Design a protein around this ligand. Sequence first.
Ligand code: HEM
Length: 148
Amino acid sequence: RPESELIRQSWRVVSRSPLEHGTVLFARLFALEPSLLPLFQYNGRQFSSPEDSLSSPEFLDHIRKVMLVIDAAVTNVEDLSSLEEYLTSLGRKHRAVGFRLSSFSTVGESLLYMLEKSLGPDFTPATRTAWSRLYGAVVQAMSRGWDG
Ligand code: HEM
């Protein structure tokens, strides 16, 4: 559609600087859901405060991964069936880390925030709506790693 392009166009801006943008996504996410923070367990140490996470290179790496999955979702915005099977298994990985199912919606409100703050006025409600459809779909796929 033209929604696919709303997405492509918004993303444009964000993949200039994906860590920086994802840094935003995650800080927002911890602000909204602090109980997520212990789920990263690099060396079986638990970050004590959000800012600790920002000093973890493993964590920053997880940001890069997040943004690359999202990036794959944008590339395939036309048909997200092509990455259903990947995303399903990726949801399974997340099941295993202790991630609740409810927590996806936060991750999604985090991404939106991040887009909204990056695009300011360009972040029109058709844009909120498109991303939300995209991310909604990513989660649908991901949720099938809780299958039942
Ligand atoms: C936001 C809450 C999330 C938490 C708390 C979380 C946590 C984790 C943890 C602990 C791992 C394992 C360690 C690591 O690879 O660095 C992991 C792996 C991964 N996460 Fe997340 N994650 C979250 C969301 C996401 C989201 C939304 C995505 C993608 C859109 C994502 C993509 C990945 C990827 C790609 C891996 C590597 C998976 C593999 O083994 O293939 N994560 N995540």
